[PDB]
Nucleic acid binder design. Structure first.
Ligand SMILES: O=c1ccn([C@@H]2O[C@H](COP(=O)(O)OP(=O)(O)O)[C@@H](O)[C@H]2O)c(=O)[nH]1
Ligand SMILES: O=c1ccn([C@@H]2O[C@H](COP(=O)(O)OP(=O)(O)O)[C@@H](O)[C@H]2O)c(=O)[nH]1
Ligand SMILES: [Cl-]
Lengths: 391, 373
DNA sequence: GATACTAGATAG
DNA sequence: CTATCTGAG
């Protein structure tokens, strides 16, 4: 009903899914007639702060020394949406003032908390999440069976209702901006996008390239594999690769019989353009079923929306439920290739078929785009969330 | 016996440690009967070029358009000492001519290369380091032979050492640069929690402006900034924030330090970069007559030149600043500020220890012998 | 195969 | 502070 919305990332602007969600959320609220202020605590900085285009509208605030500025911001809205909380690495002043903010927000402001993390390992790396949840008037999580719901919430309430949510994207806009004529897509390029955490399936991508793609003369690119501590393991296993920074992308060896070409971190818009011209995009996220309900990740949606053939993790499609009828995603003729770890041959065979038949290729991606649109477009999902928020 | 030495700073004259080493090296060679020419590439300019007194003899050359001039200079010596190489921010003409230079000097010239960098991050900003190693006849590193950047400690004392009666015990002077391992955050902290409340004053010289100040501000650290122009407007009275000087003239700082109760050099060098090498700012404190306050782990990681034992295992008169127990550090400082006799006793100790550890008379002799045979 | 997941230092 | 590089809990 035409309200003022303050979207708050108290952990900081990290540049990944929480930042992307906040940006898509802002867009939806603006598109639907509401006013939005996007605020983030800058007490902690992150590598991917520039990955998304937010600087022309985001408002940074140092919780440690600008409590007053933060307080006026969060209190100048009708609905306060908190998508992240301070990390366990911040100084006492930061968590102290954050907690102080929670206590001094007008009682009338509707506080909505979205928990974006899955594993308890990540959930524990938060400070003030308990007081955040206690002040929340509405709470969303990615799964009724996840650690947030089954571990933390039971720990705090031995209780408010926790609603499920999917992180939506304006899939129409992405396509309108990057979709390419199939004739301009290089069937030899296989592009994986993700992060350096085991459940993103980087090991499986290296394995698939070594056993099927490389031998078949194809090229593999992996974007987003930052050299964080987790990357140490890739070095210890002795996996072959060629690493490139963001200022040396054009110096990437995209010829056959080459190791996987790795990119550190990417600018979202630049990646979408490269992907729109890539034969196959890979998103191998493979979370434990307990974390899956209806949520695909932004990288899943980005593949389908930009026009490449999406290659997803089978068990992920099997354990996720289509938004329209709650049926497994794998039960639909979506055009998506469900990467099978125990049978990569069939996976590569499907890829071969598509690579040699532009018509079949085009038909299949059109199916993927419409399937993904129906499943997680902002026009549907944010409306569901809005109804729950204003319930 | 006497020889012609050309000291070449191909990166340019930055005005810090490499520049200081080059000038001290020139002094030692000249002092020991050798002819010296000091050459530097002016392709890249720097802020602290005038920090050290070199204009009366230094020879600038633009590698990009004075190759012939450069070639005749570096070829006009018996020993060529290369103390720095071109930065990656130089135009192709600069590095191209530098490599060409290495390939055209007489094969008979002894080329000595000194690697002053510590972290690999500083190394990756060096060009032509490949061909430099190839042409090099002798190579030195801080931690291939090891070396310590020596200074003529006795000469500094002789020029600035003041009677304890002339020293202001309330002044705490930190010297360094705007890079976290120089320990400026610890100095700010120490002033806030111990020095300021005790009515003491703190001056921090060398903190050049940089993006790091964005972080200093965000942390809400109080400070008053001064350019080398209005050093006269510096408020040294009690109850003041740390007083910062952006850049300093070496000779001027030594004079200021010689009259300061305590000098601080809080560089924290990971044990990997530490072997025997202290920095010039370390030596400068002990040489001008102030009480040196150094970083504890730095002294624990470094080995004394005389017997290879940790510096901290000696009764050196040096106050080892302990981030984990700053109160004890402050109590040590108070103790010395109260008894001028004890104060004099400790610095005399510091001077002799530092002299024995890294005076040019010892270190440059050691390096010359390595260079010779 | 914890492939079960997720800093610290230094230069400009 | 951001970008970049080493190599952990
Ligand atoms: O270096 C990177 C890494 C990620 N992203 C984007 O950040 C979002 C990450 O959301 P997702 O839920 O897919 O992954 P996660 O939040 O778990 O990293 C997606 O829009 C990615 O395209 C980006 O622009 N650059
Ligand atoms: O603004 C400044 C900064 C430094 N120095 C001098 O430059 C040298 C720096 O060498 P050091 O090894 O102490 O540290 P670096 O700056 O080379 O890492 C010392 O003689 C300092 O006194 C100076 O004269 N002015
Ligand atoms: Cl220098």
């Amino acid at each position: 009903g035409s309200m003022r919305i303050c979207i708050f990332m108290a952990r900081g602007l990290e540049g990944c899914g929480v930042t992307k969600f906040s940006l898509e959320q802002r867009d939806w609220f603006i598109k639907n007639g509401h006013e939005v202020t996007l605020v983030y605590a800058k007490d902690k900085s992150f590598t991917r702060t520039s990955s998304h285009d937010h600087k022309s509208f985001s408002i940074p605030v140092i919780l440690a020394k600008e409590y007053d500025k933060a307080l006026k911001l969060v209190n100048d809205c009708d609905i306060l949406i908190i998508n992240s909380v301070p990390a366990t690495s911040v100084q006492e002043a930061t968590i102290n003032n954050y907690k102080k903010l929670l206590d001094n927000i007008k009682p009338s402001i509707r506080v909505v908390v979205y928990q974006h993390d899955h594993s308890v390992l990540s959930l524990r790396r938060n400070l003030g999440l308990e007081e955040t949840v206690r002040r929340a008037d509405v709470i969303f999580s990615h799964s009724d069976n996840g650690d947030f719901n089954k571990v933390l919430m039971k720990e705090w309430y031995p209780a408010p209702t926790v609603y499920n949510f999917q992180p939506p994207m304006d899939i129409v806009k992405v396509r309108s901006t990057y979709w390419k004529d199939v004739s301009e897509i290089n069937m030899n390029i296989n592009r994986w996008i993700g992060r350096t955490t085991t459940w993103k399936g980087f090991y499986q991508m290296f394995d698939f390239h070594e056993k099927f793609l490389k031998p078949a003369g194809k090229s593999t690119v992996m974007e987003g594999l930052e050299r964080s501590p987790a990357f140490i393991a890739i070095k210890e296993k002795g996996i072959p690769y060629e690493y490139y920074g963001n200022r040396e992308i054009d110096k990437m060896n995209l010829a056959p019989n080459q190791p996987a070409q790795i990119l550190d971190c990417y600018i979202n818009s630049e990646m979408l353009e490269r992907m729109s011209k890539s034969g196959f995009g890979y998103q191998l996220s493979k979370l434990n079923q307990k974390y899956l309900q209806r949520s695909l990740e932004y990288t899943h949606l980005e593949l389908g929306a930009c026009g490449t053939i999406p290659v997803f993790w089978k068990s992920t499609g099997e354990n996720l439920k289509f938004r329209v009828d709650n049926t497994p995603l794998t039960s639909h003729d979506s055009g998506i290739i469900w990467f099978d770890e125990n049978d990569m041959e069939s996976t590569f065979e499907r890829i071969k078929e598509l690579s040699s038949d532009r018509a079949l290729y085009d038909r299949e991606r059109e199916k993927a785009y419409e399937f993904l649109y129906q499943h997680q477009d902002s026009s549907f999902c944010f409306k569901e969330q809005f109804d729950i928020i204003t319930k």
